[PDB]
Amino acid sequence: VSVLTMFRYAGWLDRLYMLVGTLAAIIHGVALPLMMLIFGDMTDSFASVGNVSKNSTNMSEADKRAMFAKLEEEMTTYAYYYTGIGAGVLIVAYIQVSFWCLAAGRQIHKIRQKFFHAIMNQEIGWFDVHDVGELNTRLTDDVSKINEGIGDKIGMFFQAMATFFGGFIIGFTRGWKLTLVILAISPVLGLSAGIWAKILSSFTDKELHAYAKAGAVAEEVLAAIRTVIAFGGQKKELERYNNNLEEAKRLGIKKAITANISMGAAFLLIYASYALAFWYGTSLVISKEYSIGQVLTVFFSVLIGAFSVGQASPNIEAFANARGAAYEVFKIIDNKPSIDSFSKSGHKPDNIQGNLEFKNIHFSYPSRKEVQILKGLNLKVKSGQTVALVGNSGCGKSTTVQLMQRLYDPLDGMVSIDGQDIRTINVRYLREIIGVVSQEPVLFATTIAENIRYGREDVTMDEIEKAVKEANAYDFIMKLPHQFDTLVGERGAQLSGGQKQRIAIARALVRNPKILLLDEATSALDTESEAVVQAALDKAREGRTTIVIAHRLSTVRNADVIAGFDGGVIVEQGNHDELMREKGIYFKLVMTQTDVPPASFWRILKLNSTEWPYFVVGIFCAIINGGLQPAFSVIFSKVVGVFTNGGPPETQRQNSNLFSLLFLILGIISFITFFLQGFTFGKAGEILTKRLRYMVFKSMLRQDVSWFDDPKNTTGALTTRLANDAAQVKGATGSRLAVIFQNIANLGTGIIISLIYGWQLTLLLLAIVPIIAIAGVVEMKMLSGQALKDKKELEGSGKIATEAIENFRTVVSLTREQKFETMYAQSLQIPYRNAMKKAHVFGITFSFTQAMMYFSYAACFRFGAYLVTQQLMTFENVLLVFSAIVFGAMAVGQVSSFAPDYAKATVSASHIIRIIEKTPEIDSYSTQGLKPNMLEGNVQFSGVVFNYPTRPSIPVLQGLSLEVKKGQTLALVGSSGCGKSTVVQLLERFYDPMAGSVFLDGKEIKQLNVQWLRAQLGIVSQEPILFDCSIAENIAYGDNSRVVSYEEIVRAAKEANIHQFIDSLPDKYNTRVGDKGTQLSGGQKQRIAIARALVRQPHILLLDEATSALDTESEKVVQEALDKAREGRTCIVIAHRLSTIQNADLIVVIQNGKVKEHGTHQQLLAQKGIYFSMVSVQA
Ligand SMILES: CC(C)(C)c1cc(C(C)(C)C)c(NC(=O)c2c[nH]c3ccccc3c2=O)cc1O
């Protein structure tokens, strides 16, 4: 059978009306050629009347009476014919929509009904085969996609074929010669599109690869930002970013030639094939057979059929997606095992049920998503035993609990029963005989008594009132309004843990159960209600058949037999007194267990007025490219005019002359004007996309502060804004020239053409164009005004579906199943009533959308008839009104297509505005006099408080003052690593101190030029920023006030010990490492990071964190570089593993932002405070 035979399944009239709607769609397709036919039929008659009026004419007014009487007699019969086709399309439109909404709805209601019930009759396999929430959500929307998968798309497919083949049958019958040419050009247009797609593709690939390099050049440089600021490499990296965008600017400009030429060639094939068909068509009259006038309008109906099949393709593509998501997951609705638990079957266990014995279990994990981790379990319980399990071990004991039901059934080992087996028996009785107590009861609610009744659906209030007492739930059912029928939200969203627990114990007791079973049930309770719950779980046991598991060895002694499970298998089996007399494994266990929505405006115009290269000739080009399109209709009007009303004189020469004019004027100009319009806005966008990207990336690379402290930013996410905004703003250029073009193809030429209308054709144009624009703008609202309300009826009906399965301990009561289906039988009924209603609404609006075609033709006939005919009827300008209506329909589509490409581009403008206005924290200041006498300085700190760029991370530095002298070490340690690290990272200016300040001596580092500061500061990175440059550059990523030379790369290699690598390899300083450093271990990377500080002679030096992940060589040969990098130069080092850096002339202990001890290392080893207490725990 077909896949669609399973979608359109069951029912009677539910299937039969699909045939009625299919027949309506066929007739609605055949009506479109018949509307073309009559305008042709009039053209045969008018080509006779009009030419006889120039050829053996009855004077020049008796023809205007005798011939015109027959024309208005005929037009009075035509007034029946086109009105009958009009009445037809109004009816079949509503019958087609009645199929789409009401016949589909007659299946889709029962499909949704049996879908919610199919989760319930999936019984066990719903737990294994994907997961709750999403499996319910995708299925809930995919059974909505089935509506299109059986609906309108199938109608549109048959309707377009009926227009196509119906038009072709008439076009063969009246003149197959031209109808064969319409077949022959279709593969040529398809081949042209088959070139256009390759031209669009294999230029964009290279534009993407050119940009991908500019992306990677931004990403690593922004991640490394404060280090690239400290080296000075911005003078290299800003041009690496620029030139990869110059390559993209060499590529996009060539696509802006080739794609525009390939579209112009497709337009040229259209103008040329139409012109050749017209000239061949009149040659098949004034020489030859199989033409007249009407045949041309018949051949145009075949082209309307090809357009109708084009309009069907997006509906067939939507139908392919409606096959898509729905038909595969339809197997989880049915073709699943579907019976697995025996949900409404089985004979009763009238051996009372109780006498279980598990044997040689090796079973699966629950849901089979994890492997069978359990190996070895055997376990007894018999009628008149509390068996208590000891040796608790999580999932490896919880499997034994979930195996107590038709939810998991053993395969790896067995259960044994003293009678008929528990896998075979009555599943409702099996749910209700046991009180199955989990610490968390995941349960749907509405009242407390209804939640208790979700244990067993047959109850009396006399059972309920005892159940709330003996579960000890009575305290809150006395405090709450309406008591046991007190109102509560879904999942119990107004109840604490111990309250839900005592309600779930009442939900057990109301069964009159014989057995108690406990999923570790003392765990996760509140310590008030844990005791009140234990007293309820003791009250729930009349000296009777129980299987208890708990973290408290109280309920384990409130019992009859211990069963011990150190790992797996039963190791001990005796009384709690016995295993404490004889002091076994139970006694061993007793000894341990007792985006920017404010879219911008105005400023955008002055910004683009600063960005753009003023190619204003593209505006003139868009105007003339628009005005050329109605000139096709002017020359075609002149062909119809001379052919209907010239008489025979010169006709073959007039047709040949107008053919030559038509072919040349459209083929030459339209190609050039589309090409030059596309190539002008393309080149404007090539400047804009490059110029914006350079300015915003340069702005980012001059503001880390107030943008990397943003928890709402991510480096790659900013690189997506660099991707998207610079492309969206490019689309926001060419679309505006397309809006200029369509205005001139429409009213900007159409009103000038109306200066030669006899007012009747102006009334015709004005009666149609705004009304068809209003119709589509209403049709929009009619559709969307259902869909939002349909979604909210479905959403409310979805909450009560997910609440039926996430609340999985409702499958452990199983009698609420058909009560949920009873809720769904009313809930699915409100959107189905909405669907029955909208079948009329869409019926009348889609019917009115046909009525405008009858009205258009009927007005065009009845505004020429009699009143213009008496003058001689206008053999011109009638065609121009229809072309202006087509340019009006084109205009509405062109303008509404670019509406989101206003809105998105105004959001991209808000993103661009934030980043061009910058953060003023890392710029070229000059209030502090830059003095050379203090490159090493005497760095003063005073009153200092600091909180990290992660802004919630507390003011961790708190009132500090310190100094470090010219050439001195200042080693820092402190109670949580923040007391040391913040002092380096504020001197980096990677954030400002919120109070206090820091000074080079008597002049402020908050006010010193950040690039002068970053000329004297060296900084050691935990990770070297790395593209595959030479080793020389992979030390020296630029310099802020120096010149890199042989001597500095010698010092930086030798002092940092990294010359171990550089003097060894091929090429020495020239050689390679790959992006991120393919052969660079931690020890090499930190020795490179030391070299990067040293290669500019750093008069002040900063060692951020004195080990990364280092040990052995990789640590001690790094310390052998740390000691060589400090001393004689003003060096701050934040001590980590104190068995790296303890060598310093001064150390300071910064406890929670204040000094607690200080001195040289040996003076602090004497101080028996914090420092010696931090040494005396490292070793
Ligand atoms: C916005 C909305 C409601 C989806 C809508 C819009 C239009 C436009 C804007 C193109 C008139 C249309 N129009 C069309 O699809 C068509 C417009 N002009 C034609 C001219 C000749 C042959 C077919 C069409 C056509 O299908 C239909 C709509 O349903």
Side-chain angles (χ1 to χ4, degrees):
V1 298
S2 177
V3 298
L4 307 184
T5 311
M6 193 185 170
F7 289 158
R8 291 187 173 176
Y9 189 70
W12 75 109
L13 179 60
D14 331 62
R15 289 180 291 125
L16 296 167
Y17 203 97
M18 304 286 185
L19 310 177
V20 181
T22 302
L23 177 61
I26 293 291
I27 297 297
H28 199 178
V30 172
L32 298 176
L34 294 174
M35 288 297 297
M36 301 291 161
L37 186 65
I38 180 146
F39 200 96
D41 302 334
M42 181 191 69
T43 303
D44 272 5
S45 182
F46 186 64
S48 182
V49 167
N51 288 307
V52 170
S53 171
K54 321 303 168 289
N55 180 100
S56 189
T57 313
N58 287 291
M59 305 179 180
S60 70
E61 176 56 12
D63 65 317
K64 304 182 55 266
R65 293 171 190 207
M67 309 300 297
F68 295 2
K70 185 270 151 186
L71 185 62
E72 294 306 337
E73 169 195 53
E74 171 176 50
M75 182 55 66
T76 303
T77 77
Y78 289 177
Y80 317 144
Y81 181 168
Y82 58 79
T83 306
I85 304 299
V89 295
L90 264 50
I91 294 165
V92 296
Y94 185 17
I95 301 298
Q96 175 161 209
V97 171
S98 176
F99 136 56
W100 173 39
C101 287
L102 183 63
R106 266 195 67 139
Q107 298 191 297
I108 290 284
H109 159 261
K110 281 158 288 180
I111 291 164
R112 282 194 170 284
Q113 198 87 63
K114 232 295 299 182
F115 151 55
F116 293 153
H117 200 76
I119 300 299
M120 305 191 182
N121 287 132
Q122 191 165 230
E123 309 209 11
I124 298 175
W126 63 268
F127 211 150
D128 318 272
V129 187
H130 318 286
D131 293 78
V132 297
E134 211 315 277
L135 180 64
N136 311 117
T137 296
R138 175 172 174 178
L139 287 172
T140 292
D141 199 81
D142 282 355
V143 305
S144 239
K145 300 182 182 70
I146 300 176
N147 288 266
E148 300 211 328
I150 74 179
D152 55 336
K153 319 309 173 201
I154 311 300
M156 295 291 167
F157 161 78
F158 282 118
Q159 174 154 11
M161 287 192 298
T163 303
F164 183 94
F165 295 118
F168 262 109
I169 287 160
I170 306 166
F172 295 135
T173 302
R174 276 279 282 182
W176 71 97
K177 288 79 175 183
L178 289 89
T179 303
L180 180 61
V181 182
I182 298 175
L183 294 167
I185 65 176
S186 173
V188 183
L189 294 167
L191 176 61
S192 183
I195 296 299
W196 175 93
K198 297 184 184 79
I199 292 294
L200 176 60
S201 175
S202 204
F203 283 66
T204 306
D205 56 357
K206 294 159 199 77
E207 293 164 49
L208 289 167
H209 282 296
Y211 181 52
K213 294 182 289 150
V217 168
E219 207 82 283
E220 166 83 340
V221 170
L222 290 170
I225 182 154
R226 74 179 175 103
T227 77
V228 184
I229 286 163
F231 309 136
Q234 305 196 339
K235 71 192 185 183
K236 181 183 180 183
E237 304 324 307
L238 289 170
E239 193 46 41
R240 289 179 72 230
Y241 186 82
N242 264 284
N243 237 278
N244 285 280
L245 293 170
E246 288 301 307
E247 297 171 47
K249 207 178 74 196
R250 305 308 172 274
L251 293 161
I253 190 167
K254 300 187 299 189
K255 196 171 69 209
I257 294 290
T258 55
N260 293 317
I261 286 173
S262 192
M263 294 183 296
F267 309 153
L268 189 153
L269 288 166
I270 294 164
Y271 307 126
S273 57
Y274 277 54
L276 288 165
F278 301 166
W279 175 212
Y280 184 87
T282 71
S283 188
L284 269 72
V285 195
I286 323 299
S287 152
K288 190 156 56 285
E289 353 81 295
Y290 329 99
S291 185
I292 177 56
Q294 182 244 42
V295 307
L296 305 178
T297 316
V298 166
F299 305 140
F300 181 72
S301 86
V302 188
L303 299 172
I304 293 283
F307 199 72
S308 193
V309 171
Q311 289 285 78
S313 196
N315 287 283
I316 295 159
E317 294 148 39
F319 165 78
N321 284 274
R323 189 312 299 152
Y327 193 78
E328 57 230 23
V329 302
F330 198 9
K331 306 305 167 195
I332 314 301
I333 302 176
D334 284 319
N335 309 165
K336 75 211 198 301
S338 196
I339 66 172
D340 322 2
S341 191
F342 310 170
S343 60
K344 298 294 168 298
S345 190
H347 42 281
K348 278 174 53 266
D350 286 310
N351 75 336
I352 72 160
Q353 185 169 353
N355 285 31
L356 279 63
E357 186 177 40
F358 294 91
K359 270 139 156 161
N360 300 35
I361 294 289
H362 296 286
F363 188 67
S364 186
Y365 203 81
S367 78
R368 285 160 283 227
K369 301 175 209 281
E370 303 186 36
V371 302
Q372 53 167 260
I373 66 173
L374 176 58
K375 292 288 159 287
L377 181 139
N378 293 50
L379 171 62
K380 302 174 190 292
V381 57
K382 302 294 170 181
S383 183
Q385 298 189 306
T386 314
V387 179
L389 310 195
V390 305
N392 315 58
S393 72
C395 303
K397 301 285 151 56
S398 185
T399 43
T400 306
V401 178
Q402 311 316 314
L403 280 165
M404 299 279 181
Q405 278 291 333
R406 303 306 320 290
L407 276 86
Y408 295 97
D409 302 299
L411 300 174
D412 335 78
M414 73 181 294
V415 67
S416 182
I417 301 295
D418 310 354
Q420 80 302 278
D421 172 58
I422 61 168
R423 311 296 151 185
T424 75
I425 56 78
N426 190 270
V427 197
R428 204 200 112 150
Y429 197 84
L430 177 61
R431 289 332 191 232
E432 291 170 340
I433 282 285
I434 315 180
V436 198
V437 186
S438 163
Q439 57 205 262
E440 163 42 15
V442 202
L443 297 173
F444 170 81
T446 293
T447 75
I448 291 179
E450 269 275 303
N451 183 278
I452 290 164
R453 190 174 178 224
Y454 308 154
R456 171 185 162 229
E457 275 289 333
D458 46 292
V459 296
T460 178
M461 188 232 73
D462 183 65
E463 293 167 306
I464 297 289
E465 209 279 333
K466 294 181 193 73
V468 293
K469 283 173 173 158
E470 301 311 79
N472 306 331
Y474 213 69
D475 82 273
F476 48 85
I477 83 104
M478 289 187 296
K479 285 176 285 183
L480 293 168
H482 321 307
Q483 302 209 248
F484 53 76
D485 275 304
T486 198
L487 176 65
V488 290
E490 313 96 327
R491 217 165 298 202
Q494 293 88 56
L495 298 164
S496 187
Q499 301 180 270
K500 291 213 306 155
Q501 185 54 245
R502 290 185 275 133
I503 293 161
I505 295 164
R507 195 185 81 117
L509 291 175
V510 84
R511 292 157 158 206
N512 308 285
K514 302 180 194 164
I515 302 171
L516 201 73
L517 167 64
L518 301 98
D519 327 46
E520 290 279 20
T522 54
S523 167
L525 304 184
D526 52 278
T527 190
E528 290 185 38
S529 192
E530 186 187 16
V532 187
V533 164
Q534 199 214 280
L537 297 170
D538 295 321
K539 281 170 60 170
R541 297 185 300 124
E542 317 87 78
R544 73 181 187 163
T545 316
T546 295
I547 166 59
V548 63
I549 316 88
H551 81 286
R552 301 297 195 168
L553 275 60
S554 56
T555 59
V556 176
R557 292 179 182 102
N558 305 352
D560 324 10
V561 177
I562 301 296
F565 296 85
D566 275 356
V569 187
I570 187 169
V571 190
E572 294 195 326
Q573 184 234 242
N575 191 36
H576 355 297
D577 103 294
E578 191 137 76
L579 304 172
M580 290 185 64
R581 280 184 266 122
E582 315 340 326
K583 292 158 182 55
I585 285 165
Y586 176 60
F587 174 71
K588 177 223 65 171
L589 293 169
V590 165
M591 292 187 291
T592 70
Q593 317 310 137
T594 75
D595 194 23
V596 182
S600 196
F601 52 91
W602 302 335
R603 195 214 289 250
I604 300 180
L605 284 65
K606 188 66 217 80
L607 174 60
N608 282 276
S609 161
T610 315
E611 291 290 303
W612 292 10
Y614 290 86
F615 302 153
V616 297
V617 66
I619 307 302
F620 170 75
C621 194
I623 289 162
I624 67 173
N625 194 41
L628 189 283
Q629 313 312 318
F632 185 4
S633 188
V634 178
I635 303 304
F636 187 16
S637 184
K638 189 52 55 192
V639 169
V640 174
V642 75
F643 185 60
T644 60
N645 272 271
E650 294 211 286
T651 42
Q652 289 283 5
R653 175 247 144 174
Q654 312 309 23
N655 293 178
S656 176
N657 288 190
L658 292 173
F659 163 73
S660 182
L661 176 60
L662 178 66
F663 196 108
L664 293 170
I665 201 74
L666 304 179
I668 301 298
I669 302 181
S670 197
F671 180 94
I672 292 169
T673 55
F674 270 105
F675 168 69
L676 180 64
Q677 179 177 355
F679 183 45
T680 49
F681 75 71
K683 288 192 301 297
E686 257 81 71
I687 297 299
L688 182 66
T689 295
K690 172 62 205 273
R691 187 185 186 322
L692 289 175
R693 275 185 176 157
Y694 165 51
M695 297 299 181
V696 303
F697 176 66
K698 180 176 55 175
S699 204
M700 293 170 171
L701 191 50
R702 300 309 308 191
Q703 51 128 91
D704 39 14
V705 178
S706 189
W707 207 242
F708 283 67
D709 45 331
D710 255 332
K712 65 158 192 66
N713 301 348
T714 311
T715 323
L718 297 175
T719 294
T720 80
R721 306 192 211 178
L722 297 177
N724 295 330
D725 293 336
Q728 178 57 85
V729 81
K730 207 190 189 186
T733 67
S735 54
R736 317 308 192 234
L737 288 88
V739 169
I740 290 162
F741 154 92
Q742 64 74 36
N743 283 326
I744 307 301
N746 192 358
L747 302 183
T749 315
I751 297 296
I752 310 302
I753 290 157
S754 187
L755 304 176
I756 61 168
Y757 289 178
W759 185 242
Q760 8 70 326
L761 293 181
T762 311
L763 292 174
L764 185 64
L765 184 68
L766 292 172
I768 297 161
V769 174
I771 307 305
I772 65 170
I774 287 162
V777 166
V778 166
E779 183 169 88
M780 278 178 193
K781 298 186 188 76
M782 294 302 98
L783 178 58
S784 57
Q786 321 313 307
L788 177 60
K789 190 267 181 180
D790 294 301
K791 266 282 177 176
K792 288 306 193 184
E793 285 180 302
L794 178 61
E795 178 183 299
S797 195
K799 191 182 180 193
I800 62 165
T802 201
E803 282 290 303
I805 196 66
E806 295 174 76
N807 294 307
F808 76 99
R809 305 189 78 103
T810 313
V811 183
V812 189
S813 63
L814 187 60
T815 194
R816 210 205 182 285
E817 170 199 289
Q818 290 155 36
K819 185 176 180 176
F820 266 124
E821 239 304 285
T822 299
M823 296 160 62
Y824 307 150
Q826 194 68 247
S827 184
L828 293 174
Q829 223 59 232
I830 74 177
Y832 185 43
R833 290 159 186 145
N834 201 61
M836 294 167 68
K837 179 218 73 185
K838 81 199 181 192
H840 167 267
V841 181
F842 296 170
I844 65 168
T845 314
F846 185 60
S847 184
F848 170 70
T849 293
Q850 319 314 298
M852 291 304 300
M853 191 182 188
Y854 158 67
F855 177 75
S856 173
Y857 282 65
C860 188
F861 296 130
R862 296 170 183 157
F863 296 179
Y866 324 98
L867 178 63
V868 197
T869 301
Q870 184 173 19
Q871 314 175 35
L872 175 63
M873 172 57 186
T874 178
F875 50 87
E876 294 290 347
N877 298 336
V878 303
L879 179 70
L880 279 155
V881 178
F882 290 111
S883 73
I885 292 157
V886 169
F887 300 127
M890 184 271 293
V892 175
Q894 194 73 197
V895 174
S896 60
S897 178
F898 300 133
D901 284 69
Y902 186 91
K904 292 177 287 145
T906 46
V907 172
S908 295
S910 299
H911 289 287
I912 289 164
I913 282 163
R914 160 60 202 122
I915 191 56
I916 69 184
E917 294 190 297
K918 216 175 72 66
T919 312
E921 174 46 23
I922 64 157
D923 294 308
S924 181
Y925 315 113
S926 191
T927 66
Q928 314 300 294
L930 311 182
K931 79 190 191 189
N933 325 78
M934 289 298 182
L935 308 186
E936 355 70 339
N938 299 277
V939 184
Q940 318 293 310
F941 301 81
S942 187
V944 189
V945 329
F946 178 104
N947 178 8
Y948 288 106
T950 172
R951 311 308 289 140
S953 191
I954 302 171
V956 284
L957 182 59
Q958 294 191 358
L960 187 65
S961 181
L962 285 183
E963 187 183 24
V964 59
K965 302 294 180 183
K966 298 170 72 76
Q968 187 214 310
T969 320
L970 171 58
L972 302 181
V973 69
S975 55
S976 184
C978 57
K980 60 184 193 89
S981 53
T982 55
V983 183
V984 168
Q985 292 151 23
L986 73 88
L987 178 56
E988 284 270 296
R989 296 184 68 155
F990 196 60
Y991 224 82
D992 188 45
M994 269 66 269
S997 197
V998 56
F999 309 82
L1000 182 71
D1001 53 10
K1003 290 292 158 272
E1004 186 175 34
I1005 285 166
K1006 302 191 180 215
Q1007 292 194 57
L1008 276 159
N1009 188 298
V1010 77
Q1011 229 62 30
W1012 186 104
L1013 175 70
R1014 283 22 200 76
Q1016 327 317 343
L1017 294 185
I1019 181 66
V1020 184
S1021 188
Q1022 293 290 304
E1023 163 64 341
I1025 164 268
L1026 281 170
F1027 308 90
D1028 199 52
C1029 310
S1030 62
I1031 278 190
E1033 296 162 276
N1034 282 325
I1035 299 172
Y1037 272 93
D1039 47 351
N1040 277 317
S1041 91
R1042 319 307 202 224
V1043 178
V1044 186
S1045 188
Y1046 173 70
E1047 302 66 34
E1048 283 296 277
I1049 68 176
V1050 164
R1051 286 203 314 101
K1054 274 69 177 84
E1055 290 179 44
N1057 313 321
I1058 190 59
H1059 70 132
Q1060 293 154 355
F1061 186 77
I1062 307 176
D1063 294 34
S1064 180
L1065 287 171
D1067 347 308
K1068 314 302 168 190
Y1069 289 101
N1070 305 281
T1071 206
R1072 298 313 187 107
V1073 298
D1075 294 18
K1076 306 308 306 173
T1078 199
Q1079 84 289 46
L1080 305 184
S1081 186
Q1084 298 154 272
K1085 281 192 163 201
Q1086 318 330 147
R1087 292 199 291 274
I1088 289 164
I1090 292 281
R1092 302 219 176 155
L1094 294 177
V1095 81
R1096 314 107 75 260
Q1097 192 62 293
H1099 303 92
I1100 299 160
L1101 180 63
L1102 306 177
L1103 273 58
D1104 254 330
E1105 294 306 329
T1107 177
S1108 58
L1110 317 167
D1111 219 330
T1112 186
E1113 173 283 318
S1114 182
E1115 188 259 69
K1116 288 285 176 265
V1117 185
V1118 169
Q1119 181 57 35
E1120 196 240 341
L1122 301 197
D1123 263 307
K1124 294 181 193 178
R1126 71 170 196 73
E1127 204 160 301
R1129 70 213 101 162
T1130 305
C1131 187
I1132 305 182
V1133 57
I1134 66 187
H1136 188 309
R1137 176 187 279 207
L1138 302 184
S1139 60
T1140 61
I1141 188 71
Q1142 63 186 247
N1143 301 328
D1145 29 314
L1146 179 64
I1147 295 148
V1148 182
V1149 188
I1150 304 170
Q1151 300 301 76
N1152 300 66
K1154 311 92 189 167
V1155 183
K1156 176 56 207 63
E1157 295 103 37
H1158 70 87
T1160 317
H1161 180 39
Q1162 302 81 3
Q1163 303 150 19
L1164 285 161
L1165 291 176
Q1167 289 169 78
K1168 305 312 186 188
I1170 302 299
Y1171 186 83
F1172 189 76
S1173 190
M1174 291 188 72
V1175 174
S1176 186
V1177 64
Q1178 162 70 114

